[PDB]
A = this chain, B = another copy of it.
Amino acid sequence: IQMRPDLKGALLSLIEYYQWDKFAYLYDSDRGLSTLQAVLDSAAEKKWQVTAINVGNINNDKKDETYRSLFQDLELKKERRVILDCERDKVNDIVDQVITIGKHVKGYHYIIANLGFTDGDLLKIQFGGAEVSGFQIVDYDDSLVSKFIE
């Protein structure tokens, strides 16, 4: 009995709405790659130039050296469209280093590929200028959740 709904179907639709042709897809092998297989299977059917990068196996004492070196390879093709298919805790780690190098101004556009968009801290990139999309399954606007949050 899987309480988590299928997100891969929703992510494939959001990439179509924004009309993306080539983008970066960051993923971690720990959470898996079922959604990575979904965007790769449709990469041929819908003509996408996905630059998939495995950000999973990285040490914690080399975060500043590997993350800054990661966006150096994301600059060879002038990547400006990135999908973050990671956990909430790992998104904030990527978000923080994006702000340090300054890749969050008017021009970039990120997609947080998890069902918890408002769960992580994101006021950090709220005023940078880059558009940030995501998905929310816990709609805090519903009255049932409001009685729960109180």
- Contact string against B for A residues 108-129, beta-carbon threshold 8 Å, 1 for contact and 0 otherwise: 0000000000000000100111
- Contact string against B for A residues 33-49, beta-carbon threshold 8 Å, 1 for contact and 0 otherwise: 00001001101110100
Cβ of B73 and Cβ of A45 under 8 Å apart? yes
- Chain A contact surface mostly: mixed
A75 to chain B, nearest CB (A): 10
**Of A11-19, A50-58, A85-93, A139-147, the one touching chain B:** A50-58
Q: Which B residues lie within 8 Å of A51 (CB)? A: 43-44
Known: A54-B37, A105-B105, A127-B68. A44 touches B77 (CB 8 A): yes
Q: Which B residues lie within 8 Å of A41 (CB)? A: 52-54
Interface size on A, residues (CB 8 A): 27
The contact sample of 26 A-B pairs, CB cut-off 8 A, is A37-B52, A37-B54, A40-B52, A40-B53, A40-B54, A41-B53, A43-B51, A43-B52, A44-B53, A44-B73, A44-B74, A44-B77, A45-B73, A47-B76, A47-B77, A100-B124, A100-B127, A100-B128, A101-B127, A101-B129, A102-B102, A102-B127, A102-B128, A102-B129, A102-B130, A105-B105
